[PDB]
């Protein structure tokens, strides 16, 4: 029913440009606010663009300003990113991923939580602290910490993602303790002052992937992504 499916993903030339598509199916895609997130090789999870719901506002990155242009096209029901001047750095696979309807409106900052994702798209140009890894056999229980200040996770609350390597990260907990429709309860959240936790009892093969935390930081003014936890069984 409801997606995202993205188009355009190319090798360029240092310096080229291309254009990239995020077509939605299901629902109104200028009734939410939206963002590009990429991962470079080897990175994590950066916030590169969004638009605001009911406007046609943007706002971009400081790494990707000036360079890179977002619009909708209502016509179409999609958005595009227009990104010119590439540069090697800029290489990576792009997502693009709505904001709930839930965290588009007032205090969407506050809940600011990503539902449904884009496939991602690779392009080719040529301070949320968590534990780098965590392990555990089957059946045993993980935790993963989340740990900032008073900006981000003080302020604000707390989404988790999980992403198998090359694949769409999926959300599994928002709003700091809720889970979406199918995510299992072995996953649980929780969020104490200037730090969160992500807890998996009864870990499944499964459940081996990449784990992300998320909250908007005041100061920034950007939503950020922690530098991210490979969990093993």
């Known amino acids: 029913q409801v997606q995202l499916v993205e188009s355009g993903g190319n090798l360029v030339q240092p310096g080229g440009s291309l254009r990239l598509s995020c077509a939605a199916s299901?629902?109104?895609?200028?009734?939410?606010?939206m963002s590009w997130v990429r991962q470079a090789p080897g990175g994590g999870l950066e916030w590169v663009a969004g638009?605001?719901?009911?406007?046609?506002?943007?706002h971009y990155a400081d790494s990707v300003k000036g360079r890179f242009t977002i619009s909708r096209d209502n016509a179409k029901n999609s958005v595009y990113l227009q990104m010119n001047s590439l540069r090697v750095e800029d290489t990576a696979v792009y997502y693009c991923?709505?904001?709930?309807?839930?965290?588009?409106?007032?205090?969407?900052?506050?809940?600011?939580?990503?539902?449904?994702w884009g496939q991602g798209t690779l392009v080719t140009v040529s301070v949320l602290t968590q534990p780098s890894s965590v392990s555990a056999a089957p059946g045993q229980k993980v935790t993963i910490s989340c740990s900032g200040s008073?900006?981000?996770?003080?302020?604000?609350?707390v989404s988790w993602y999980q992403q198998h390597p090359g694949k769409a990260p999926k959300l599994m907990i928002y709003?700091?303790?809720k889970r979406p429709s199918g995510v299992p309860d072995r996953f649980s959240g929780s969020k104490s002052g200037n730090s969160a936790s992500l807890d998996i009892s009864g870990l499944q093969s499964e459940d081996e992937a990449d784990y992300y935390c998320?909250?908007?930081?005041?100061?920034?003014?950007?939503?950020?992504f922690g530098t991210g936890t490979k969990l093993t069984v």
């Open positions: 709003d700091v303790s």
């Open positions: 008073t900006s981000n996770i003080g302020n604000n609350y």
């Open positions: 998320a909250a908007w930081d005041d100061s920034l003014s950007e939503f950020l």
């Open positions: 991923a709505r904001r709930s309807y839930d965290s588009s409106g007032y205090w969407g900052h506050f809940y600011s939580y990503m539902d449904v």
């Open positions: 638009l605001s719901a009911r406007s046609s506002l943007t």
């Open positions: 299901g629902f109104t895609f200028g009734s939410f606010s």
